[PDB]
Design a protein around this nucleic acid. Structure first.
Ligand SMILES: [Mg+2]
Ligand SMILES: [Zn+2]
Ligand SMILES: [Zn+2]
Lengths: 1270, 87
DNA sequence: AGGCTGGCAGCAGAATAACCGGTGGCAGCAGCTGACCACAACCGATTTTCTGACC
DNA sequence: GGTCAGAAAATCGGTTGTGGTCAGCTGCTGCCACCGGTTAACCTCCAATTCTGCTGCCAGCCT
């Protein structure tokens, strides 16, 4: 493969580098540990920085100085040696170090599982002892010479042991003669009876230890003969003395060694084909631990066997050296130097290697030479990965040095710090303020930032307008800010969008493209309707401004990413540029109606007519400008330019009232007329009260019936009138607008009596320490609810606080209850409720103890909100990494499969009640089969979008189930199709054929973090979502049934036990150790003994594990279960996600199958392969001879399914960088760059959006008649 | 990185070479060739006085007189303003 | 009589102090140059074109 | 009341002439910077949690 790195790529293949590749990459051998001369600062000869090896430092200027031009190019200076070329070849040329003894790679020995240990079948503790010089190893042994010398050497051994026994009986006879001499010299000495015999007992004890020593040496000789007779390769020999004795007695018949040289010899004497045949024989025949061990060995043995790799690359003879511009020595301001910590590791390797060469060529004993080799091995290991085996090598101040592998791992590595997220030019920050006179496609840009961003454009333009003569004087004029530059800057800033981005960017609407305009100031004036999408307050938050340069980038920022093209949210489809809180208070005040206000229509007669009617809204506005008519009083105008509602239109004009002209009478207020003049001309008259849900429904209906430019202009008009009537609304907070209820003392006394009675009963002793806590908690919860109800019925309907709450602007009622009323109960650092409670409201003022109690829950909430955003960011990262390869590739898979949808289940009395979760389950997805009603015709044909009129028609015709088309059944090969995806929620049309629906789904799921509170052992917040997507076994693991039948309940000690009696007379299934706290499941009735259960009924309360429901009820019912359990976490906090954003993630878990029977085709049991690869192999293999490999479905989480991908470049940048690279190297894996993250790293066009071949190869030319007419 | 390409000196150098090529091309051919070979604007190799005299077939005093006259002609402001702003 | 199956237990890893000799570099500088500007003059036609007399 | 040799202008260019002038080594000479070898009373062993997978280990039916 080429290495010039021009942009013609197809692959990126990683392998295992051999020594003949390393000394073919290198440009020369670095052989001195010198970097730079201390006085003249020039790179030393044959050092780590040598110009002869790594190229010259000065552009086309050699070292000694003999050749100094571009005329001399590629010539070698015959005195000094440097070639003359550029100085950027010092980042592209490597050197190598010639080791005097081989050294093993640390990656293939230490990281579990140890690949050297699996290849050679050596334990890791018996491999570290070899390669770190602690135990010998028999590399080879003779057989037939051993066979006949067994007889000859056992004859010699018997002779030697017989001579040992001869000296032993010499000892026996000598001690006998010594004891007889003691008998002669102690048989006639008058002494004690035992003192004359204790000397003989001491002599016999000396004989006893002589024969003990004889037993010791005979056991030593026996052990030596035993370990010769049981000698084999790959056998460790500890006790250097014993190995030495074997060497000097039996120097023939075997060879032994110690270290990486011995490991290299064992790898050379190794037959991969015979080893693989033995391993496959074991996995075909045996069972258990031996079969599991043989599978785990067969992984790496088959990896080394299938390719053209060799195992000999795991030991090294030549380390390579990274080029000297990637480990620079940079002189600071004032002679301080800075090196990059790799020069110390390379210097230690070079020093120890030179010392080893000196010791070997000198001639030194084995202790010194082996210590030197062990030191060299430890140096190379610390170079490749520091802190892997033993203590990390420290620098000054006791910090660990940064080795080669630490440039790659973690958040500080290359893959995450420089390849995926970079600093950019043409960018800047400021602090945002509110810009409520701007249009929706505009942003204010301060002039001092805009000048610095648009400096090259303004330099070109003020050279072309002859304000300057050239670029240098133009740049001087711009940097001195002479006053022509503003008149140029306005004309170069006209119609040129910029992107505004606010960190963190949780979802895709966090980057939007406005059209700038200049603003005298230093703050970026933002529109007040995009703060919900940006999630921006104005407490000092900051926003970043980028700038698109090329024509494609400006077209993208003008069409795809413009601010007034993204009204609807891509998650649920609700509008995000809807007016919020302040325009909502304004429009609610404008459209509410007050009974009995000024100028109200009254039909009182007998003397005078009605005097409430008006002839036009112009006359009504004149009367309201006088002091006669209030805006919110009921009148009878005569409208002529506002379209009537459908009933009045069909009554008066019937069909075709051409509403520019016709006249009709409306009994509304004047505020509703002024509101309906903002809506478009064809929109019918609303005549309601603008609660925020009513405004959301109006804007959603507008976005589904009218163009997006009309929706944007309507939203701006609503903003203007909302602010103007919010000012005149009289919304202020004072201390007299916060009224306290007048019965709070009576309610608190009535519950204080019951609390005192419960505490008195606890002092009596009729209930323990926890029952009184539960009773007090229940009493004060009832008291809190009663105080809140009294407050709600006491407050008038036109209070400022209750108007703010009731209009949907901000807040809820519990904040009003704690502001006036009762704070209630409070939590603990543990989480339980302190049963005091807090009986004072913040208007009355908390006391000292109540304030100190409240601070616990407040600070715990602050710390939890600090943690939860990092947790949600991690979840979004893993979801993006799993679902990055789901893009839309076709228009029709053309399948006939599809899921069923619940669609408004039946009522018991008999009618059709609408299911509540129908806007996130049935809307916006294409029908799969036709809808046929109770032996009738078609209501909705196959292929329709199934929107609101279709759903209304189906529910009117009275059907309940439809077969809708979903991405879990999309039958295309790579990526989902487009009719299976349904409509895009952000546009309202069908989804396009380049959309990145996986990234949209991942950001839509992971963005409503930080509003998933846990509670106040089943998890119920954010960690419930993480343990569903990771497909873990839950905490409250409630078992499920395995077969239909009758439950035989058994009650053991302190807990339960359930055994299900099958109806079909099958085997009884037993669940034993189900603990006390798991209460029994209740359906319809509690699960009693003798009850009847189905095949997949959950038996207890808790959470069934998703592996078990897959094993029992097939792959469909684990897709029902995962979607249902995720959506009940989001619905509890009032968050809407469509179900097609969860089915994209769920379809990416069940892609793979597990192999149970190999059959005849290369699939080891227990491995996980893709199902599209599995079925394509089975059709090829059972043709011409049927041997089908059998497979079962499997369910894997979102961390296993993104590390077991097909690309080693997308997998290494995710997680476990050292482990992913170290076995992609063994398999010689090739990446095809088909991904969406591999293309970001290497810097080419992503294959999604405007980077696919359908759209990138558009040929644009003028037409025939307009070419001629110009 | 205090020794990198400053991204405006490169484009300024390109415009300087363009302007110098223009002003050298608005002269006589022999004088322009003499100036180019004298200051090494052809291929980066400056040529000697006798080398220019050898390849143009005149004497070295004639060559240096032509060079002095051409240097005066370029130093004249009428040709020299548009390069005077560059330095 | 031990063995190989089973949990059980325990652990790695990832994410959030002098001498002496010698030898080559080196910088400083008179001292051959030797090519080179360099003014500076001095002529070698060269062409025009009056200037001067010729009959 | 007109034609032909001489005189007098820059002009393009060769000579030339020497008058320094600057460098290009060139010894060369002192020196200075750097590398290598040598020293003979004695005294001989170191300074946080969570999850997943792997391996070591001990009772214990089975032969
Ligand atoms: Mg803020
Ligand atoms: Zn050189
Ligand atoms: Zn499909």
């Amino acid at each position: 493969g080429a290495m010039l790195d021009v942009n013609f790529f197809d692959e990126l293949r990683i392998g295992l580098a051999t020594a003949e590749d390393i000394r073919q990459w290198s440009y020369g051998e670095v052989k001195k540990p010198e970097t730079i001369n201390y006085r003249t600062l020039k790179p030393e000869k044959d050092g780590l920085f040598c110009e002869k090896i790594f190229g010259p430092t000065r552009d086309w200027e050699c070292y000694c100085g003999k050749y100094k031009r571009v005329r001399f190019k590629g010539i070698i200076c015959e005195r000094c040696g440097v070639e003359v070329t550029r100085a950027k070849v010092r980042r592209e040329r490597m050197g190598h170090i010639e080791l005097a003894a081989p050294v093993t790679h640390i990656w293939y020995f230490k990281g579990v599982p140890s690949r050297l240990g699996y290849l050679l079948d050596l334990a890791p503790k018996d491999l570290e002892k070899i390669i770190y010089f602690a135990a010998y190893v028999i590399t080879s042994v003779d057989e037939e010479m051993r066979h006949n010398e067994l007889s000859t050497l056992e004859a010699e051994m018997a002779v030697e042991r017989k001579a040992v026994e001869d000296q032993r009986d010499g000892e026996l006879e000598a001690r006998a003669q010594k004891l007889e001499a003691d008998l002669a010299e102690l048989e006639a000495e008058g002494a004690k009876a035992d003192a004359r015999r204790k000397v003989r007992d001491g002599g016999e004890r000396e004989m006893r230890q002589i024969r003990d020593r004889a037993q010791r040496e005979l056991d030593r000789l026996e052990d030596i003969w035993s370990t010769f007779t049981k000698l084999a390769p790959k056998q460790l020999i500890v006790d250097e003395n014993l190995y030495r004795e074997l060497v000097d007695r039996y120097g023939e018949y075997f060879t032994g060694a110690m270290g990486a040289e011995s490991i290299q010899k064992l790898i050379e004497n190794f037959d991969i084909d015979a080893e693989a045949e033995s391993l496959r024989d074991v996995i075909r025949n045996g069972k258990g631990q031996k079969k599991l061990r043989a599978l785990k060995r067969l992984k790496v043995v088959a990896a080394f066997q299938q390719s053209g790799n060799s195992p000999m690359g795991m030991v090294l003879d030549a380390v390579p050296v990274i080029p000297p511009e990637l480990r620079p020595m940079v002189q600071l301001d004032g002679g301080r130097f800075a090196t990059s910590d790799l020069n110390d590791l390379y210097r230690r390797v070079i020093n120890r290697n030179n010392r080893l060469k000196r010791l070997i060529d000198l001639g030194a004993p084995e202790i010194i030479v082996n210590n030197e080799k062990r030191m060299l091995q430890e140096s190379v290991d610390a170079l490749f990965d520091n802190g892997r085996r033993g203590r990390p090598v420290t620098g000054p101040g006791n910090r660990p040095l940064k080795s080669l592998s630490d440039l790659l791992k973690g958040k500080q590595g290359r893959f995450r710090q420089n390849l995926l997220g970079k600093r950019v030019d043409y960018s800047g920050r400021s602090v945002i303020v509110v810009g409520p006179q701007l249009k929706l496609h505009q942003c204010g840009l301060p002039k001092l930032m805009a000048l610095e961003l648009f400096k090259p454009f303004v330099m070109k333009r003020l050279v072309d307008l002859n304000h300057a003569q050239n670029i240098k004087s133009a740049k001087r004029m711009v940097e001195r800010q002479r006053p022509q530059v503003w008149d140029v800057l306005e004309e170069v800033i006209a119609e040129h969008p910029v992107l505004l981005n606010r960190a963190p960017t949780l979802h895709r609407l966090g980057i939007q493209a406005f059209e700038p305009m200049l603003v005298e100031g230093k703050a970026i004036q933002l529109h007040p309707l995009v703060c919900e999408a940006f999630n921006a307050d104005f407490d000092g938050d900051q926003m970043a401004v980028h700038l698109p340069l090329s024509a494609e980038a400006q077209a993208e920022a003008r069409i795809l990413m413009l601010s007034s093209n993204n009204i609807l949210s891509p998650a649920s489809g609700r509008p995000l540029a809807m007016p919020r809180l302040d325009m909502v208070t304004g429009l609610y005040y404008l459209t509410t109606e007050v009974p009995g206000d000024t100028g109200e229509y009254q039909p009182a007669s007998g003397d005078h007519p009605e005097t409430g009617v008006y002839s036009s809204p112009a006359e009504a506005i004149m009367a309201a400008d006088r002091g006669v008519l209030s805006v919110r009083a009921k009148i009878k105008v005569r409208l002529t330019q506002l379209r009537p509602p459908v009933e009045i239109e069909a009554e008066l004009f019937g069909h075709s009232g051409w509403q520019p002209g016709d006249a009709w009478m409306a009994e509304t207020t004047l505020g509703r007329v002024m509101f309906n003049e903002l809506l478009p001309l064809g929109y019918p008259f609303v005549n309601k009260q603008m609660h925020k849900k009513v405004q959301a429904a109006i804007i959603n209906d507008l976005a589904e019936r009218y163009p997006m430019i009309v929706v944007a202009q309507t939203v701006d008009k609503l903003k203007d009138a909302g602010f103007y009537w919010a000012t005149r609304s009289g919304v202020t907070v004072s201390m007299a607008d916060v009224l306290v209820p007048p019965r709070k003392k009576e309610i608190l006394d009535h519950y204080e009596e019951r609390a005192d009675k419960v505490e008195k009963q606890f002092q009596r002793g009729a209930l323990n320490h926890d029952e009184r806590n539960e009773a007090l908690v229940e009493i004060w919860k009832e008291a809190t609810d009663e105080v809140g109800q009294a407050l709600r019925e006491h407050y008038p309907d036109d209070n400022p606080i209750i108007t703010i709450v009731d209009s949907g602007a901000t807040g809820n009622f519990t904040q009003t209850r704690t502001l006036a009323g009762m704070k209630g109960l409070v939590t603990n650092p543990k989480g339980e409720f302190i049963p005091r409670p807090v009986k004072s409201s913040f208007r009355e003022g908390l006391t000292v103890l109540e304030y100190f109690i409240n601070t616990h829950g407040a600070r715990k909430g602050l710390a939890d909100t600090a943690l939860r955003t990092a947790d949600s960011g991690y979840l979004t990262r893993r979801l993006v990494d799993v679902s990055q390869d789901v893009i839309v590739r076709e228009h029709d898979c053309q399948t006939e499969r599809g899921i069923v949808v619940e669609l408004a289940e039946r009522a018991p009395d008999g009618t059709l009640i609408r299911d509540p979760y129908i806007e996130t389950s049935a809307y916006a997805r294409t029908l799969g089969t036709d809808a046929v009603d109770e032996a009738g015709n078609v209501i909705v044909e196959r292929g329709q979008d199934l929107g609101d009129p279709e759903i209304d028609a189906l529910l009117a015709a009275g059907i309940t189930q439809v077969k809708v088309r979903s991405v879990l059944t999309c039958a295309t090969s790579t990526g989902v199709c487009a009719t299976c995806y349904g409509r895009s929620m952000a546009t309202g049309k069908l989804v396009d054929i380049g959309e990145a629906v996986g990234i949209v789904a991942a950001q839509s799921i992971g963005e409503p973090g930080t509003q998933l509170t846990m509670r106040t052992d089943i998890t119920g917040g954010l960690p419930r979502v993480q343990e569903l997507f990771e497909a873990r076994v839950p905490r409250g693991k409630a078992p499920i049934a395995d077969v239909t039948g009758r439950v035989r309940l058994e009650d053991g000690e302190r807990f339960y036990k359930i055994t299900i009696v099958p109806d079909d007379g099958g085997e009884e299934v037993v669940y034993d150790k189900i603990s006390k706290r798991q209460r029994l499941r209740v359906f319809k009735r509690v699960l009693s003994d003798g009850d009847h259960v189905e095949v997949g009924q959950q038996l207890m309360e808790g959470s069934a594990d998703p592996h078990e429901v897959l094993r029992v009820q097939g792959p469909r019912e684990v897709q029902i279960h995962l979607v249902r359990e995720v959506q009940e976490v989001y619905r509890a906090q009032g968050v809407s996600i469509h179900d097609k954003h969860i089915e994209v993630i769920v379809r990416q878990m069940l892609r793979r199958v597990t192999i149970i029977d190999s059959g005849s085709t290369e699939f080891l049991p227990g491995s996980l392969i893709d199902r599209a690869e599995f079925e394509a192999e089975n059709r090829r293999v059972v043709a011409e001879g049927g041997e089908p490999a059998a497979g079962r479905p499997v369910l894997m989480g979102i961390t296993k399914a993104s590390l077991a991908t097909d690309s080693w470049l997308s997998a290494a940048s995710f997680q476990e960088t050292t482990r992913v690279l170290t076995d992609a190297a063994i398999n010689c894996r090739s990446d095809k760059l088909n991904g969406l993250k591999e293309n970001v790293i290497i810097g080419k066009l992503i294959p999604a959006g405007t980077g696919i071949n359908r759209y990138r190869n558009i040929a644009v030319q003028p037409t025939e008649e307009a070419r001629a007419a110009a | 990185d205090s020794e990198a390409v400053v991204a405006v000196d490169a484009v300024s150098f390109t415009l300087l070479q363009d302007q110098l090529q223009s002003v050298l091309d608005t002269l006589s051919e022999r004088e322009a060739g003499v100036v180019r070979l004298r200051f090494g604007l052809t291929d980066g190799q400056p040529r000697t006085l006798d080398e220019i005299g050898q390849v143009y077939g005149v004497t070295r005093e004639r060559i240096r007189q032509i060079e002095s006259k051409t240097m005066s002609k370029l130093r004249h402001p009428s040709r020299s303003q548009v390069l005077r702003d560059y330095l």
